[PDB]
Write a protein that binds this DNA or RNA. Sequence first.
RNA 1: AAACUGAAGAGUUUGAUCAUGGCUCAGAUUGAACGCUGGCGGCAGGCUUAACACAUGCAAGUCGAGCGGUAACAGGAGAAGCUUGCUUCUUGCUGACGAGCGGCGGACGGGUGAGUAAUACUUAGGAAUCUACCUAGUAGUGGGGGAUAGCUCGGGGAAACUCGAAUUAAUACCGCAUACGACCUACGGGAGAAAGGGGGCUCUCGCUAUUAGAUGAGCCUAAGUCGGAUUAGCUAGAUGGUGGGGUAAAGGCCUACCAUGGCGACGAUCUGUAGCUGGUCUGAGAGGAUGAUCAGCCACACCGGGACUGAGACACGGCCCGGACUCCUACGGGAGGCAGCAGUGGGGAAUAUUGGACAAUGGGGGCAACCCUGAUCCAGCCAUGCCGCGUGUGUGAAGAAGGCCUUUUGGUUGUAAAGCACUUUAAGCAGUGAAGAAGACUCCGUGGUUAAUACCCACGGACGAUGACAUUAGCUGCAGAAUAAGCACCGGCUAACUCUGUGCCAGCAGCCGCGGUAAUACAGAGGGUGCAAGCGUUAAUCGGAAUUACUGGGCGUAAAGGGAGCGUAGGUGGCUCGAUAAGUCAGAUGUGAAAUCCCCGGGCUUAACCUGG
RNA 2: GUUCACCACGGUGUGGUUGAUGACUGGGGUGAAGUCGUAACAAGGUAGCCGUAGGGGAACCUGCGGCUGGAUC
Lengths: 61, 87, 79, 81, 212
Amino acid sequence: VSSYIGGEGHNLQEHSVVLIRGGRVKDLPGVRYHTVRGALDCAGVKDRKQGRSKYGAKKPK
Amino acid sequence: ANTAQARKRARQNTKRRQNSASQRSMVRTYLKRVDAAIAAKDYDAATEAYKKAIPVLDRMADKGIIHKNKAARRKSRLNKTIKGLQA
Amino acid sequence: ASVLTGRVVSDKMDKSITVLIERLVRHPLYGKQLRRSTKIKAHDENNVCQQGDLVRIKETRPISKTKAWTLVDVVEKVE
Amino acid sequence: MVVIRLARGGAKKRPFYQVVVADQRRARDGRYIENIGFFNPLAKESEEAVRLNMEAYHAWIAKGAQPSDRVASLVRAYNKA
Amino acid sequence: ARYIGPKLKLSRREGTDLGLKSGVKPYDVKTKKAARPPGQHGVSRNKTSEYALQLREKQKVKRIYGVLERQFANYYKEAARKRGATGENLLAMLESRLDNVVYRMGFGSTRAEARQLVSHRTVMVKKAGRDEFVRVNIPSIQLQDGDVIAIQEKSREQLRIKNAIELATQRGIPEWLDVDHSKLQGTFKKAPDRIDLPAEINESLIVELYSK
RNA sequence: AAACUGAAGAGUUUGAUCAUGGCUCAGAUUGAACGCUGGCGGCAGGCUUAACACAUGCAAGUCGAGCGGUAACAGGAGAAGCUUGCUUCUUGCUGACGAGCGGCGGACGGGUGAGUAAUACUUAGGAAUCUACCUAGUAGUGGGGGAUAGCUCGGGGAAACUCGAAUUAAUACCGCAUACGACCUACGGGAGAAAGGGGGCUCUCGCUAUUAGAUGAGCCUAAGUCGGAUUAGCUAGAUGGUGGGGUAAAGGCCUACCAUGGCGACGAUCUGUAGCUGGUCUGAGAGGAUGAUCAGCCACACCGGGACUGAGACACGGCCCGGACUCCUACGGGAGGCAGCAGUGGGGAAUAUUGGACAAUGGGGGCAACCCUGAUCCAGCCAUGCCGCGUGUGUGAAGAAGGCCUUUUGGUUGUAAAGCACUUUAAGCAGUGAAGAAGACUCCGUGGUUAAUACCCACGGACGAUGACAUUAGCUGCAGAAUAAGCACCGGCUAACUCUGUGCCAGCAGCCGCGGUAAUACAGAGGGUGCAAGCGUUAAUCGGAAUUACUGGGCGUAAAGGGAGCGUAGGUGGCUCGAUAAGUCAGAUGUGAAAUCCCCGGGCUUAACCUGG
RNA sequence: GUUCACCACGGUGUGGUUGAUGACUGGGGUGAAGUCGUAACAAGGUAGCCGUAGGGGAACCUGCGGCUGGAUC
C-alpha cells in the first residue's frame, strides 16, 4: 500500500523500514495509511516544536 | 522413559503382561472347547467342556485377568445354550 | 416418570413406531410461539398400534441405535 | 477421598480461606462439593474470625471426608469457646 | 497530582471568588484584575454556548476543592448510584473529604494549606465506634457521621495553625461541625445539607454535563 | 429496610426551505501497540502472531516397619602397624543407604485451544454400570510349591545396551484348603480368595470376599446453541427385529439372517468458520459484540496408528510400530519431543526472571522422622490498567525585570516571580517493630484398649522446634523546598486568540474545509483551554444509528407492491352451551455452582482490593 | 515361529472445489486549456420515458405497442 509522509521534510528512500498506521488522507485518492514519524527508519520532523509527539520529535533542551 | 521410576514402571509392565497374557490365553482356549462342542451339537461333550471351564473361567476373574462380570456373563450365556441343547 | 404424547406417523418397523411430538417453542426475540415437531422412535413390543394414533411414550433405557422410548398407552386410535 | 480443607482467597499478604469440602484431587482453589464457612487469619478482636457450619462438618464426617490438619485444629479451637 | 500554578487566575476564569487565598485581604484587592479572565484578551466578544456554562460550572467546583477530573468523575459515579439527588450527593462527598473538613473547622487558612496539613501527617482521624486516633496522610478520606478530627501532638504548636484559627472565626464556623480551639479538636457531626453551602454553585449543570 | 434511578445531539446535498438519506463527529471500553514525557506506592495484568523449532537447568517422587542386601556414608565393637596418640582392617553390628526385586503415586496438580457445528457445551432428567484412597459393616487372613531380579561366571556391543549358564528373598508368582456375603444355576447343586510387616498374648498397619455410603468415571434422553440454498435431496450396517459375540454397563458396538426401512425446506447433506459456559464490554432497556486473566466442562500433548499396566489412561515429562525433523556414531547402529516453569532463536506493532522457599494453603509417599512438589506462596521486570499520594504552603505591588501585544504607552504573563515566614507526605537516612504459626516433638493427666498399670488411639494441660517473603506492614525520630510536569489542543462541531513567517508553495485535515501578500485553520512564538504521571495517535467493539426499527422504521411521487390470478405448506380466523387443561396465569418444591453484577454491612490510614449476608 | 483376518504409513489412477498468476480482451472509474458532435433539461427546438427489434462514428435514430412522470391547446 501507499502511506502518507506527514510533516515538513523526511529521510525516506527505497528499502527504508517504516511503521504504517491507519488513517486516510482525504485529498489523496488511494492513500489510507500514515507513516509513523520517528518509529524505525523514518526520522522525526527536524525543527518541530508544538505537535512534537505526532511527528516523533524529542523535547528540545 | 526419562526418570528411574518411569523406566522401572516400563520394565515392570512387560513382566506383568507376559504373565497375564499366558493367563488371558488360557481363559480363551478353555472356551474354545465349549464353543467347539456346541458347534457339533453334543450335550455330553459340551457339559464336560463347560464343566472343566468354570474353575478356570472364574479363578482367572478373581485374579484380575478378566472381570467377574465377564466371567458371570460367559457362564450364564454358555449355560443358556447347552441347557437348551436337549437338556 | 417422563411421559410424552404424540401421534404415530410411521409404524413400518418391527416392534417400533415413529412418534411426532409437537411443542410450542417461543421465538426469543419476536415472542411468537412457533409450533415445532420432533420424530421420536418408540418401542411397541406387541406391534399393535398403527399410524395416526395417539400414544403415550415414556423415556427408558435405549433399545436400539436411535430408539430409547417405549409405548405405554394408546389413548386414541384412528377414526 | 473427600477432604475438608481451606481454599485461599483474599489478596497478596492478606489471606482469607474458606473451609470447603472437596474431592482431594481437585485443585486447591478448583471444584468442590460444598462450602461450609470461612477463616480470617488476620482479623480483629471484634470480628468473626472463624465460622463453620458444624451440622454439615459432622454430616460430612460420618459420610467419609477427612479434615486437613489446619481445619481440624480450626474446629478444635472454635468449638472450645 | 494537584494544581500548583497561580490561584487567582483560576477564580478569574470562573468569574467568582474560589477561596484560593486566605481572607486577609478582600478578594478584589488581592488580585485587582478580577473583572477580566486571565491572559491577553480575557473580556471580549463571542457568545458562550450551553457546553461552556456546563464545563465552567464543573471546572469551578473542581478548582474550589482541588480535585482532578478522574477523582471527581468517580465522585459523580458514586453520587449517581447513591440514592437521592445526584448533584447533592456529589456536593456532600466533596464536603466530607478530610482535607476539606480541616479547613471548614479552622486549622487551614485555605484548602491548599489544609491539604498540606492532612498530607504531612499532622491531623489524626478517629472513626466513630473505634477508640484509637490513627494518623492519616490521605486528603480524600470520606468522613462519616461522628468522626472526630484532632491535630497531632508534634504539630499542635504550629505557628501556621494558630493564625488559621484566628482568620476562620471571621469566616465563621458551620453548624454541622463542632470545633475546640483550646484542645485543637473537632467533630464531623453531620454531612452538610444543600442549603448549608452557597447558592451560586449550580449543581444541576454538573449532572447535566456528565450525560454527554 | 435495600437491591427498583433510566434515554441530549451536531456538521455536511440547497440561492434558500422542509423531508428523505448516507457519511463524519462528540461517549465508553482494551491482555493493546506507537509517539512525546515520566516521581512513588497498593492491587491486578503481561506471546492475542508460529499447535513455529527448541540449547541449558528444574517441573514425580517416596517407602528399609515388604525383601535379599551393603555401592557410598557416618558411627560402634574388637585386629590395635601403634608410627604413643599416631592410627587402620574385620565386621549390615547400628544410623542409614546407591543400584535391584516389591508397593503406592505417576490418570492429580500444571499447559494449550489445534481439532471439534456436535461422542462438545448449557439446562433438565434417566438406568443398564464400574469406582484405588476415605466412612460404616460382614466373613476371613489356613497350608504348600516352583521360580527369579540384584549377586555370580563367561561372552557380544563405540555406545544405547545385550546374550547365555548358575542362582537367593519377599506383602513378587502359582497350586491346594476352606467361603457371611458375592457369581452361575436346570435352582437339585456347582465352582471362586488372601500376606505378611510392626509395637509391648494383645494391638496396629496391611491383605482377601463383599454390602451400604461418599467421591469420581462411563452411558442415555429431551430442549437450546454461527453462516451460506449461487449447497435439496441424504443414507446400505444404512432403519428395525431375532440368534450369537462384545462391554464394567444400554446400544448396529460387532456379526449371520430376516424385513425395507431411517433422515430432510421445523434445512437433512455439503460447505465455511468456531473450543462451550458462568461471564466481559456496550447499551436507558431490549439488544449488539465478545469468550484474556478467575471458575466449570471439553479436547489435545512433534504427526498417524495400536495397545499394555492399572480402580482409573488408549497415558504431557510411559510402551510399541510407522513418519518428518534434530543430534551422536567406531557407519553396524542409536537418542529426543518446553502447548509444565524459567529461557533461546524466529515471527511480530507488541507481552517479563534461565529468581526464592516449601514458612503458609494443598497434593504424593511414609508408622513416624522426613523427603518431593516451577502447584502454590512470594520476590524480579514493564505507567499495561485501576486506585491513591506527591512534585510544596502561606504571605507578598510604585504590580520588578524579561517575553508578547500595543493606539507607544498602556495591557498581559501576574501574587506569578523575587523577598519574608513556614511544612516535611512521598523518596533518602537511622531506629524500633506486629501479623502471617496452625504449638510439631517431649513430659503429665483422663478415657478407651487390653491379660495387663505395656503398646496403640482419642481427649485435656505444659512447653517453645519451625518465616521464603524480610533490611516486612506499621510506628518513632534526622535533614532540607529540599529529589520530582509533561501531553494534546485553541475556525465550527468543541473548552480556549493573537502576532510573525509563508504565499493554492511549504503544509494541515475526523468532517465541513484552510493555504492564491493583512491565514484566529499551515510553521514558530506569546497567551489560553483540557487532562495530568500521564497525554495524544492508530487498531478494535458497542453507542449515538429509530441507519434491520422486537421494544422501535418504511413502500402514490424520496429506495421499496410481485404483471395478474389460482393455489400447496404455513399463518390467521364468526356466534352459543359443554368437556379438557396442552398453551396462559398463580402457588409449592427441586434446581439454576462459586466468583462476577446490584443492595446492606465489615476490614485494609483512604481508595482500588478483600470480605459476611 | 509360520499362516490367515483387521489395519496405519505409503503408492496409483481419475475427477470436484478453490487461491495466485496469464499474451490478449470487455466494460467501470479517476485525471488537464483535448477531438467529434449536441442526446437530455423550456414544446430543449422531431415531447420525453418503458419493453422490444433493426440500424448507426458517438451521443443516438427508426418501427410496433404502452405511459404522462408531456407544454400548447
